[PDB]
Design a protein around this ligand. Structure first.
Ligand code: HEM
Ligand code: PIM
Length: 449
């Protein structure tokens, strides 16, 4: 005969099975898989079967699985066109990923990054005046382009960037419609805007490169990563790297941290405004903490409990990545259910972070869950997964947390924020593999004191 069918969730009778629903309501769909199927259930994503695992036992299998068992490498095909075919530092598949963020993520670099991040925020709110309104996506998306580029590539580089880079990068991120699992190069409008956006980014970098070659003045110093790549010559004296190759690398370096930090910063603010009591606790803590006269570069690397717990709760309720993917490289049994090589295996932070048994009143904002006595994040090692877990746990976790600390250490002490629309109107756009805060997301601010 053949192989036993795995539990399959209801619906999925559209052109690409469950793909359409995954686009309009991925969380509702993934939740229905768990409700109907249990810890192991499936849904059809175009021609691919997704084995969605949930619960502590199945998640453990998922996160502890080695690269040889559940391959993460080709589990996110929507990234292929974004990163590009460009090749700067040719090395192993694991090497390439390391080179992207390892250097800048060094602990010894953290202090500097916090100072850089503080500078980026003050610069971003420099023209805010006494009072006004902003849109969280516009503000945070752009801000994080500045923090990401300045920290990962260099300050000199960020100083040559402006809103254009952010607008284009945003289009890049929107070029991740689920249809990417069919083919990331399909004749889709979003995919075309993606390719065009990328081309626009390459052009912005080419302009910078040209500008630097013509006029490189300064104290003959401050030379950043772009300067080094520009100066690299091939054996004949010709520049070795094109603007595309360089841009492709820069894009790759700041991608992971951009959509995540932008959305997480937005939701942190949203949850603080939604819960004035937590907001007030954070302010008191911030004013009291910085009362020692130490800098953000000092405090952002150290304990700021109230804010951190708000952040953790914000991440539990609004995990930037609502689904994690792998490609099975063999057969494995998980609770009597068999996974076959070629199967897309997934885990969902969106779903797992709200399992009723692991997180009392999973739908409520309770930063106290992470307080010393409770520590629900640490106790549920396989289900509190905003940063994933196991072998592929987010290597940028420390940086991201420090960044949030740094950003709000400035924002919450300079301005007071209030929602300019109904608290329930703030929502995410889950139509793309890369979750983005949906607009409008209007917020009012006013100088404190
Ligand atoms: C609070 C914001 C962030 C969240 C919620 C987050 C979340 C995650 C999650 C859930 C994973 C696991 C993916 C998988 O299992 O396939 C992951 C992986 C990863 N993240 Fe993040 N991340 C954040 C920020 C960052 C930043 C800022 C960087 C770069 C400095 C980064 C770099 C990475 C890398 C390189 C991996 C792959 C690790 C590996 O496969 O070994 N992340 N992240
Ligand atoms: C595809 C897979 C993972 C990521 C990511 C990791 N950390 C933040 N985003 C972004 C795209």
């Amino acid at each position: 005969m053949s192989a036993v069918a795995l539990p399959r969730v209801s619906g999925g009778h559209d052109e690409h099975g469950h793909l359409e629903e995954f686009r309009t309501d991925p969380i509702g769909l993934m939740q229905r898989v768990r409700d109907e199927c249990g810890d192991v259930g499936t849904f059809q994503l175009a021609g691919k079967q997704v084995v969605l695992l949930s619960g502590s036992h199945a998640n453990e299998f998922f996160f502890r699985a080695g690269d040889d068992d559940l391959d993460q490498a080709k589990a996110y095909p929507f990234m292929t066109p974004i990163f590009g075919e460009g090749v700067v530092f040719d090395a192993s598949p694991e090497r390439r990923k390391e080179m992207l963020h390892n250097a800048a993520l060094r602990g010894e670099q953290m202090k500097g990054h916090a100072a850089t991040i503080e500078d980026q925020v003050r610069r971003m709110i420099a023209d805010w005046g006494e009072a006004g309104e902003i849109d969280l996506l516009d503000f945070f998306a752009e801000l994080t382009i500045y923090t990401s580029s300045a920290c990962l590539i260099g300050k000199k580089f960020r100083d040559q960037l402006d809103g254009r880079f952010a607008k284009l990068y945003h289009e890049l991120e929107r070029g991740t419609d689920p249809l990417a699992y069919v083919d990331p190069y399909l004749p889709i409008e979003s995919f075309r805007r993606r390719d065009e956006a990328r081309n626009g980014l390459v052009a912005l970098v080419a302009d910078i490169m040209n500008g630097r070659i013509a006029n490189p003045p300064t104290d003959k110093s401050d030379r950043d990563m772009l300067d080094v790549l520009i100066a690299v010559k091939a054996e004949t004296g010709t520049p070795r790297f094109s603007a595309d190759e360089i841009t492709g690398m820069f894009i790759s370096m700041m991608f992971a941290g951009h959509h995540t930090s932008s959305g997480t910063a937005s939701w942190t603010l949203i949850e603080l405004m939604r819960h004035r009591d937590a907001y007030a606790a954070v302010i008191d803590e911030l004013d009291e903490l910085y009362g020692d006269g130490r800098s953000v570069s000092f405090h952002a690397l150290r304990q700021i409990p109230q804010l951190e717990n708000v952040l953790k709760e914000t991440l539990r309720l609004h995990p930037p990545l609502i689904i994690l993917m792998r490609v099975a490289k063999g057969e494995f049994e998980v609770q009597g259910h068999r996974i076959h090589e070629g199967d897309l295996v997934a885990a969902s932070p969106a779903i797992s972070n709200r399992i009723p048994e692991d997180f009392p009143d999973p739908h409520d904002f309770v930063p106290a869950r992470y307080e010393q006595p409770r520590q629900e994040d640490l106790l549920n090692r396989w289900t509190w997964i905003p940063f994933g877990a196991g072998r592929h746990r987010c290597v940028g976790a420390a940086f991201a947390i420090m960044q949030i600390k740094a950003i709000f250490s400035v924002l919450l002490r300079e301005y007071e924020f209030e929602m300019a629309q109904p608290p329930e109107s703030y929502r995410n756009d889950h139509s793309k593999m890369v979750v983005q805060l949906a607009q409008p997301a209007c917020v009012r601010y006013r100088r404190r004191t």
